[PDB]
Write a protein that binds this ligand. Structure first.
Ligand SMILES: COc1cccnc1CC(=O)N1CCC[C@H](C(N)=O)C1
Ligand SMILES: [Zn+2]
Length: 139
């Protein structure tokens, strides 16, 4: 679990969005596993606007943060799960690091701010949904 709170927006994994997220929907994209909903309170986070390929993510299955080197956002094949058919997920960045299904939502940060959230993984890999291209989150 996990979310990014920026301005009057809440960013979550689309597959973990709640009834309240869908009732306050701003934007969603199944191909990116992202959903953004509106909030009444002002957020606590800020978004990186950079090309960093190193950062630190929170891993809830170890209660710890780990440093990672991650690939640029790209179209990556993701196996079928209980939430999606087998498909290409876009704007996804892979890294070597521990992750389990419940780790989705953990934040990845670089020195400039929030880069993305855990969205996929397996066998010593962890994949993050990028949010740095969503310029409208800041306005
Ligand atoms: C962090 O997730 C891990 C980690 C290790 C092993 N299986 C997972 C789960 C996983 O990859 N997915 C299930 C939920 C939806 C995901 C998606 N974006 O399509 C795919
Ligand atoms: Zn950065």
């Amino acid at each position: 679990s996990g979310a990014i709170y920026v301005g009057n927006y809440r960013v979550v994994n689309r597959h973990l969005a709640t009834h309240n997220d869908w009732a306050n929907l701003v934007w969603e994209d199944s191909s990116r596993d992202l959903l953004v909903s509106s909030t009444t309170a002002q957020g606590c986070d800020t978004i990186a606007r950079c090309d960093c390929q190193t950062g630190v993510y929170y891993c809830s299955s170890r209660r710890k943060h780990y440093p990672v080197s991650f690939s640029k956002p790209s179209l990556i094949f993701v196996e079928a799960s209980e939430y999606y058919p087998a498909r290409y997920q876009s704007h996804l960045m892979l890294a070597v690091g521990h992750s389990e299904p419940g780790d989705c939502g953990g934040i990845l940060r670089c020195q400039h701010g929030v880069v993305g959230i855990v969205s996929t993984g397996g066998n010593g890999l962890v994949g993050f949904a990028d949010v740095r291209d969503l310029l409208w989150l800041d306005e």
